[PDB]
Amino acid sequence: NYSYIDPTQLPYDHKWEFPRNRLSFGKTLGAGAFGKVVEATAQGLIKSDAAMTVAVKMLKPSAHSTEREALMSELKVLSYLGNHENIVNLLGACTHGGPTLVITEYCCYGDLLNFLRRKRDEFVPYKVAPEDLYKDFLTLEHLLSFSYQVAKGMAFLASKNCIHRDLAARNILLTHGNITKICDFGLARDIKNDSNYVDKGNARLPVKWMAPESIFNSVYTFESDVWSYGIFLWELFSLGSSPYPGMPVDSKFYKMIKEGFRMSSPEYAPAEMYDIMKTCWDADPDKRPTFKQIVQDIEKQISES
Numbered sequence: 152n153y154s155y156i157d158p159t160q161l162p163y164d165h166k167w168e169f170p171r172n173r174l175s176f177g178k179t180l181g182a183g184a185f186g187k188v189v190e191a192t193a194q195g196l197i198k199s200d201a202a203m204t205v206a207v208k209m210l211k212p213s214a215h216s217t218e219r220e221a222l223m224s225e226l227k228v229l230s231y232l233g234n235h236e237n238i239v240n241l242l243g244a245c246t247h248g249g250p251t252l253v254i255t256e257y258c259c260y261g262d263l264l265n266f267l268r269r270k271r272d273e274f275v276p277y278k279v280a281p282e283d284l285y286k287d288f289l290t291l292e293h294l295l296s297f298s299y300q301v302a303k304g305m306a307f308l309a310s311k312n313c314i315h316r317d318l319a320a321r322n323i324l325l326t327h328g329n330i331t332k333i334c335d336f337g338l339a340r341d342i343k344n345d346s347n348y349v350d351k352g353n354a355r356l357p358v359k360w361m362a363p364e365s366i367f368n369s370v371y372t373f374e375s376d377v378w379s380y381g382i383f384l385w386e387l388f389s390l391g392s393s394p395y396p397g398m399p400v401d402s403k404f405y406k407m408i409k410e411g412f413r414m415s416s417p418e419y420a421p422a423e424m425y426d427i428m429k430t431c432w433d434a435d436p437d438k439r440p441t442f443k444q445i446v447q448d449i450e451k452q453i454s455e456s
């Protein structure tokens with residue numbers, strides 16, 4: 152599950168350890184068969200005795216030994232990555248005296264996919280009438296900023312030799328100020344009943360976001376994440392539509408991907424952003440751009456707009 156890094160050899164820094172009893176669990180933010188993410192308040196996180204709201208990831212009583220390893224391995228990965236601007240920020244953890252708890256920041260606006268669909272109908276391509284700024288309409292400027300932030304976050308993950316493997320709008324959190332945080336819901340997502348994940352072998356995988364080498368050879372690299380980022384761009388500029396609309400993942404889908412069929416540009420994608428999508432979807436991973444190159448490309452687009 153780890154292409155390059157070895158989490159078993161990666162230490163869990165004990166500066167992260169947080170007292171279990173100082174958390175007050177609240178509403179459930181998301182849940183899968185074995186794990187869940189809950190909103191919570193932590194008492195002694197901030198130096199002054201003032202409480203702050205956090206999100207906590209934990210396993211359910213249904214979880215087995217495989218999931219207990221995965222949650223601890225996830226904590227080691229998050230601790231190894233450290234805090235970054237474009238990544239959801241680990242705040243602490245609880246590792247003894249009970250089950251593993253992973254504490255991160257709370258992102259007020261939820262996941263990006265639901266945000267795009269919530270904002271889709273009032274989307275504004277050009278400038279917002281200056282009286283209408285209180286409406287906080289979704290604009291093309293916001294979409295470009297989202298692509299830029301996620302590309303920077305993925306560039307940082309690549310620099311840490313880390314492969315995301317499930318990059319999609321559903322795995323992007325959104326905070327105040329239209330700032331995105333890459334995340335991985337993992338076990339806290341009900342992939343069993345999520346139509347975006349597809350039965351393949353004995354796993355359920357996000358096939359429509361996956362590069363061919365990941366589908367057919369189970370190969371995950373920096374450049375297979377780049378492919379997923381291209382699908383994410385299509386999600387973004389279609390305002391939250393499902394990729395390859397109307398095409399179920401079946402034998403014809405695999406042949407069409409293999410033979411070079413690619414999606415058309417979504418209705419709201421600038422031509423230069425669609426140019427990025429096509430290069431991300433190159434059958435040859437070596438011909439695909441790097442995330443660092445994508446950041447440079449998008450940065451020039453934002454300046455010239």
Ligand SMILES: Cc1ccc(C(=O)Nc2ccc(CN3CCN(C)CC3)c(C(F)(F)F)c2)cc1C#Cc1cnc2cccnn12
Nearest residue numbers: 180206207208253255256257258261314315316333334335
């Ligand atoms: C409590 C919690 C715990 C953990 C994580 C989490 O995303 N962990 C994570 C695990 C791994 C990876 C990277 N790997 C991917 C796999 N890959 C094979 C290895 C590398 C990353 C990543 F960000 F770097 F991508 C993140 C998020 C939350 C949340 C939350 C939260 C905050 N506000 C809200 C509002 C609504 C809902 N949730 N929510």
Ligand SMILES: [Cl-]
Nearest residue numbers: 210219250251
């Ligand atoms: Cl546990």
Ligand SMILES: [Cl-]
Nearest residue numbers: 153154313314
């Ligand atoms: Cl990894």
Ligand SMILES: [Cl-]
Nearest residue numbers: 326327328329
């Ligand atoms: Cl916002």
Ligand SMILES: [Cl-]
Nearest residue numbers: 416425426429
């Ligand atoms: Cl074209």
